[PDB]
Structure formats: structure tokens, C-alpha cells
Design a protein around this nucleic acid. Sequence first.
DNA 1: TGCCCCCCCTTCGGTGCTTTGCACCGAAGGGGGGG
Lengths: 415, 553
Amino acid sequence: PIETVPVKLKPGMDGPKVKQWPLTEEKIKALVEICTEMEKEGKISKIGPENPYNTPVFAIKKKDSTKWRKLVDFRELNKRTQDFWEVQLGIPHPAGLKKKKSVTVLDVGDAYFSVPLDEDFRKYTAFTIPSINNETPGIRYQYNVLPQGWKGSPAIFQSSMTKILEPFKKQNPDIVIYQYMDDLYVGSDLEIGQHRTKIEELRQHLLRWGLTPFLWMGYELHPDKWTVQPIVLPEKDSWTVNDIQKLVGKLNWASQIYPGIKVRQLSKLLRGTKALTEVIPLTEEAELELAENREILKEPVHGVYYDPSKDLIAEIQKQGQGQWTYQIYQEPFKNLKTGKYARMRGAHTNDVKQLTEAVQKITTESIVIWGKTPKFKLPIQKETWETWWTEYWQATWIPEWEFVNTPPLVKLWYQ
Amino acid sequence: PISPIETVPVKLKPGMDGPKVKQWPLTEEKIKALVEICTEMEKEGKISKIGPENPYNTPVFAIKKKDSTKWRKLVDFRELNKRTQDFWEVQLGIPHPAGLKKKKSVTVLDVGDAYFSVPLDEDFRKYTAFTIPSINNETPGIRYQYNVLPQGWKGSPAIFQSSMTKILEPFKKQNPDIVIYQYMDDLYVGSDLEIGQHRTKIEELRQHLLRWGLTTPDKKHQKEPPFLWMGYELHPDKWTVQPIVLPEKDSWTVNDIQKLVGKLNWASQIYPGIKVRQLSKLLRGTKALTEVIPLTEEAELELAENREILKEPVHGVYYDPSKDLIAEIQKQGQGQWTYQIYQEPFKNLKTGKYARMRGAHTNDVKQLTEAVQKITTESIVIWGKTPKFKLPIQKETWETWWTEYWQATWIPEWEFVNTPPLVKLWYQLEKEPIVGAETFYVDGAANRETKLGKAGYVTNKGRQKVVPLTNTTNQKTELQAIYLALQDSGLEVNIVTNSQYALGIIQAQPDKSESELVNQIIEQLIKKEKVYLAWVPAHKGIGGNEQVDKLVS
DNA sequence: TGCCCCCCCTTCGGTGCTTTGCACCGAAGGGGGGG
Ligand SMILES: Nc1nc(=O)n([C@@H]2CS[C@H](COP(=O)(O)OP(=O)(O)OP(=O)(O)O)O2)cc1F
Ligand SMILES: OC[C@H]1O[C@@](CO)(O[C@H]2O[C@H](CO)[C@@H](O)[C@H](O)[C@H]2O)[C@@H](O)[C@@H]1O
Ligand SMILES: [Ca+2]
Ligand SMILES: [N+]
């Protein structure tokens, strides 16, 4: 006897019509078992071809987890679904979450299955389960309850969510709790033992409502230890023509970010037509120019701030040897954060797994810092990414992405 | 008494009305054979006659069955299809015999009058109206509306196909020991049961279908191999495609070559080594479908090589899940690649080919990677897993490529097979400037209006060159400047350009290009022993860059 | 002079940085195949 919250699509927008991609035998078997159990429990019901919508579905295993977990790629539906901030159901984002010494991420999406979904909106959740060798045509379903991975699920469930958290929040006023998609982010400045203890309390606190993929898992973050990667100029005692050419190139590029950078005095050193390996000494004027440029790169960029109404963009460069650099911004050359990753899973053997890890890491940081996930510019060929990325995806959400091919003419973020 | 097959709700697109297309003139031979078929549907109840209150109509025609003495009724619902809602097709792919496991007993059925045994939506039948001339338009004639799925309506395939699955669902769940491959009305059913039990379950299935109004005539009931299915022939231990007819015409039109290349592709799924590069190359061009094309010396040999492959009958084997999948790739030249998939040596599950040329400039390694990606996805579709790869590329070559390339790339678990021609990188760019090698500052520029330009260089030893160029572009002159420096330098050279364009191309170590010039640059790069390319910004007063920029500008 | 699905090869127009030329990619029309 729970009334359904009516949901609309953005005016002038149809529903998602995204084709189902092929699934490995292990993923189909998992889905067929998961859907058989969801159909018995009424969480999903079969449909036919008269429903013109469709969203891709597959399955993942979270880190250090041996059990499958259904994942629907609701990216297309989420972009077409009415923004609930206009409905005032938006979840505010706490600026103090990134400052906590520890942050645990709990998968609470399971609770969304208790809330029914608006009848008129269920047709938009249609998905199709394929079969190996196309033995059986696609078997289509749709959701009757709040589906995991849909941006409307946490929004509608928030009214129920806040009540469940009421007693724990009042007993622990210094703990930060943020809800994003199927995940709950819980941060504290406590000691790890006390922190993990409080997290266990919140779990059992949830089962108190549970009796009235699973919840037992949690992942630890430490945002207070997150660092950035600035643009750096090498320190040499002797410079070759080539070195100064690279430096002038890099500085000339960097001037789009720091408008005070000059290269006039350094360029004049390349006045002749010299061999690239010729060592040339720095003039008195060029010595001060370099030092002053280093000074400029030390201070922050002027007029760079986070605008809550603009999308986040993330660019990633493969630097080689397991090193990966990234920048996050809303306006070009106004980076809100720059970073570097190294020695991730896959390092020195698998580019795609490493990049998959990088995208997950950057998204997780964006959620903690701004409550948004960025749109990624990926340094990979579309076909290469689409063939493998699902083998390494371990998150319950999926960010937007596009594919780029930018030869590194200037090693700008990594020497 | 049959079980009524629940109707599928169907609607027209909002604000759109039924079709009104009338009928085009029909030959008497066709007008006659039609009325006989319409009356049969009236008897069986497939069509109702009352149509005076119906303002709609859709043209009708007919064509024969594939090598059959029976005409086929078709309705041109193209107009109704536009005004009909959109459906989500449930047919996601085509089964392949290499994905089948061996079975002790097998059967193949066909449902008689598939579309006409499924009840159409009550409210939608009015728009399926159609008129047939009684006698050459002498009298008004018999109008009809469909009571079942008609042919020509875009919703017929998906609706019948979805209904076919809802009918089979209870039989499969109550009989897990059986496998049923459903493709439209075609039906494959196999089990390892004793033949007697198999015939029993088969008849139980025939009865189940007849219980929902679906007949399985004995004329289409295949009981003995070789079973004809999906265009193949299924034997107990091996499978094969149905014979391929290659046109041997001595005068080739554009459409002839199209049909030829089409059958060669279809044959490539089991016949290994098929090539279509030179034959398809004859098709490139805005020629009419009827224009005659003379086969090139290369195209004639390529056709001859393919003929030799098709002379011998080839068969594939079936899938054993207990064994790993092997995929082996060989380079065929000119961006062509064939492969074989197998579990035991020399017993192929299937074969295939990759010859896609994507990108203006590429190399064999990128293409081998693309071939691997094709085979991987194909393997997941047919078996749901990735095969282990045997590739004609050394671990060292691949390591050098993927670790240095600026794009993320990867290949699943694989091993080297020494089967020339091997894939390799044809040149390597230095990471540091070369000591004692001449430094060429290259540059080029072209006039946007006259399309005239200049390319040239100046070196640290005083060597200089400027060459005039006609009908060119900025980008072309930049490549030309680099080309000149390569021609005029010794075996080791430092080259400084400001062309991001040229550097992006060259730094990816292409070995093939659609650009004659780039190919010439590649030929030079292969001859060098050390080559260091560096980029500098323009108009910054840099070394020879300011000097070379004035010369060619 | 129909409908639905898969595949390869060529062409063509839209898109975005290599920029006003060139590279990429998806749609479409040709062919093969299935019902
Ligand atoms: N060319 C075709 N156009 C079609 O619309 N169909 C459709 C989709 S599959 C369905 C089958 O028709 P029905 O069973 O009468 O036709 P059939 O020849 O496959 O079978 P049969 O004569 O009933 O045994 O017709 C098939 C064609 F080959
Ligand atoms: O890799 C992108 C690829 O995915 C598809 C289909 O799965 O679309 C999905 O990914 C897009 C890129 O982020 C999203 O914009 C879209 O919403 C999502 O369905 C393809 O459209 C695309 O080629
Ligand atoms: Ca039939
Ligand atoms: N120039």
C-alpha cells in the first residue's frame, strides 16, 4: 500500500532505445538466475515487442567480491529522465566529505526494490536478455519497482532514506553521509577501528529496517590523502637546444593556463640554426625568465572555481610505464583538479584494465568532491574500449565517455 | 479447440491515420491466382470480408515461393509501417552451426502458415484493409481486412517471433533435457535421448504447437540427415554450407561483381583463405550497376585463387564446451587477414576474414589488433567466451608497440606462431636527439587562394633547399618538407618541424597509407637507421624554424 | 515496386581539430545469407 511517485521524461524526448550488446556465457547465466529470482518476487515482469524502448544490461563483480551483481546501463534513461532537482528531490552534497580521514562506500541499492515504480514509467525500463549463439530470441523485461542505477531511485527513496538514518545521525553528529546512485558514502575523522565499528552499526541499523552486491560490503577511501599533479618544469644545470625547444613548447602551451608566462627571452637562445644536441648556456635574461615562470606555475590559476550548473569533464593521458595523468574541468584551461595514477591493477600488462581502473578512480573522486560524475575523454579507439571495458568494471554506476586520439607532441603533464 | 494466442496491443503513431493507397494495375495472371488464395483465408477464418465502413486500403501484389509452385501474397504496407508505432525487435542475431553441440537425435520442423496462425490486434485489423480487382476492374471487387499477422507489415516478424517464444516457454521449462533453436517458424530440436524417446518428445512438441493453432506439416518435417537448416547441411559429426554458385560469366557488370564478392564473403565462414581485396577494388567508383568492368590482372588471379579454395568441399565441426577455443590468424597481404577457430588442430569450427581499411594511415599491428577484436566479439556471440589466440607477431614486437603507443591498446591471452609473413614494426623513432646527426629544420606553406606553395629546410651545417609546389595545401607542404629532409640526409637525422599534422601521422609508425606522399615518407623512414622527430611552435623566433619559415613563406 | 535480423565493401555527409583541409565515423545502398 505505497503510493507511487509519478515520473515524467524531459519534454520532447522519447525513451531509451539502446541495443543489447553480446554477453559472455558467465554473464548471461548470472543474469538468467538473477532475473528468474526477480520475476518470482515481482520486481520485474516479462514484456513483448510492442514496447519500443530498451536499455543494455550486463553483470559485474565488485572488488574482492565473488558473486555477480546485475548492472543496467541506464545512462540513456538517466539523461532523458526529468531532473528531480526541479522537483526539489535533489540530494545536496556536503563539502566536508572530502575532508574526512576515512570514507566507506556501502551498496544500498537493494533497498530500492521495496518501493513500487510509477506504472506509466515502467515501460521506459525495458531491457533484453540475449542468448548464446542466438538459440532463443531476446527475452524482454521491465521494472515494477525502483531499479538500481536509475537516477530517480535514490531521489524517490530519499524520503524513506532520511528516516532510516535519523537515529544514527543523531547519535553520531560528526559523521557525514552522502547518497549517490546505489551507494552511501560515510565519512569520519575517527580511528579506523572506531570508524569500521560505526560502519558496522549503520549496517545493522539498516537491517532493523530490513526486517521492518548485498549490504555487507564496504570500500575504504581516504580523501584527506588525495594529492594533485601540477605542471612542472625540469631542473637542469645544462640545457641542449632540444631541451630549450621542448621547454619553449611546453611553456608556450602552459601560457593558455597561466597568462603571465613569457618565452621571449628563452626563444632568443634558439636564435641560430644549431644542432639539437648542442649545449647552450642560459643568458642572464633567460635565467630570470625561467625562475619567474616557475613562480607563476606555483600559484593558483585565477578565476577557476566550481560551477554547480556546468558538467564536469575529465581528460586522461597514457604516459607509459603504468603512469596515467588526468585533469578535471568545466571550462577549458580552468582545471579544478589535476592528478596522476601509477602501479594500478594491470600495470605493465593491460592498458584497458588500467584505464578502466583510472576512470573508476576519477569518478569516485568527483562524486566525493562535487557529487557529480564527469564525462570522460578516453585515449583509446572506440572498438578497443567497447570490446573489453566490461571485463574490468567494478562500480555500480557508469559515467559518460567519448573517444579521442591526441598524439603527445608536448609532454605537458609528465616529464 | 485451440488455445487462443493472446493478441499483442498495437497502436499507430500519435495524430496519424490509417493508410489510403488504393491499388496499382495487376496482370490478369496475378489477379486470377490471388482471388483463390483470399477465399482460402476466408474459409479458415484468417480474413473477414465486411469492408464498406472501412476507408483505408493498401496495395497488394504477389510473387512465387523459392522454387515452389505456390504464389506468395504480399501487401505493400510501407505507408502503414510509417504510421505504425515502433517495435523493439527480439531477433538479435543469426545462429551458427559452429555454436551447436553434438546431439544423438535431431529434428527440424517448420510451422505451416506462421503469420496466419497468430491473431492480429482487434482494433488494428481495420488499417490492414486491401482491395483485389474482381475482373480487371470490371466490377468493384472483394475487400478484406486481416484477422492475423500479414506479410509486408513491419510488426509481423517481431510479433510472431515473440508469440512463438511465449508458446515454447512452458515446453522448454518442463523439458530441460532438450534444445530448441527457434528462428522465425524454423525449428531445430536436438537431444541425446534414445531415438524412440526423441520421436516421442517431438510429437509432444508437435501436439503442443497444434494446441495453440500452429501446424507442423510432414512435408517440412526433417527426420533424416543431412538436415537443411539456416542455409547449411547438418551431419552427425560435421556441418557444411549449402553449395555455393559462383557466376562464371565472361562479361562482368558492376552488379555481377557485387554478387560475386557477396558469395565469396558468405563462403569465407568455412572456406579458409578467401580474398576479395582486388575484386572489390574493381567496384570502387561511381559506375552504374550495368557498366561492364574488365577484370584486372590482380583481380583475375584473386578470383582464380578463390576458385581453387572452393573446388574442394570443406566442413566444419561442432562445439565441445569442455575444450578451449583456439583462434589462429594469418596475414594475407594488402591489409587482408584470414583466421580459423578450432578446438582440436585441423578441425575448424569456422573460418572468417578481416580486410577493413579504417583510417587514412595505419600499420599491420593496428590491423591485427582490429582482427582480434572482430574474432573476440564473434566468439562471444557464438560461444560466449574468448578464444586463446595464435598470432603471427613476436611478443617483443607487440610489447614495443603497445607500451610506446599513446592510445591504450591490448590483446587477450595469446601466443606467437611462426607462420610468415610475420607482423612487425617497420621503423622506430628515436626518443632523444641523435648526437652528430645533421639537424634539418623543415617547413612548408601554401597560398590558400592560388594553391601554390613551397617546402624546404635549412640545416645546422648550412644545407638549404626550397622547392616550389603547385596545386597543394599547407598540410601537404609540411609533409613535403619532411620528405625532402629524409631524402637529403644521411642514415641518421634530426628533423625539427612545426607541423602537428605530420607528426601525429608519423609518430604512429604507419606502414601503409592512402596518400602517395605518406607512402613515400614511409619508404624513406624504413631506409633510415635513426630518425628523431621534434615539434616546435611557429612564429616564436626559434632556431632554424624562424629561418625556414621565412624561406617557404 | 512488401517486412524483420546478421555479415562485408563503398560512398557520403556531418563533426571536430590536424582546422577552412583532413581525419574520423555512422548511415545507407549495393551485395551475400536466414525466415
Ligand atoms: N520472403 C519472405 N517474406 C516473408 O514475409 N516471410 C515471412 C517471415 S517467415 C514467414 C513464414 O511463412 P509461412 O509458414 O506460410 O511461410 P513458409 O513458406 O515459411 O512456410 P509454409 O509454407 O507455411 O510451410 O513468412 C518469409 C519469407 F521468406
Ligand atoms: O561507448 C559508447 C557507446 O555506448 C552506447 C551504447 O551502449 O551508448 C552508451 O554510451 C554512450 C557514451 O557514454 C552514452 O552516451 C549512452 O547514453 C549509452 O547508452 C553507444 O551509443 C555508444 O557508441
Ligand atoms: Ca513455414
Ligand atoms: N608560415
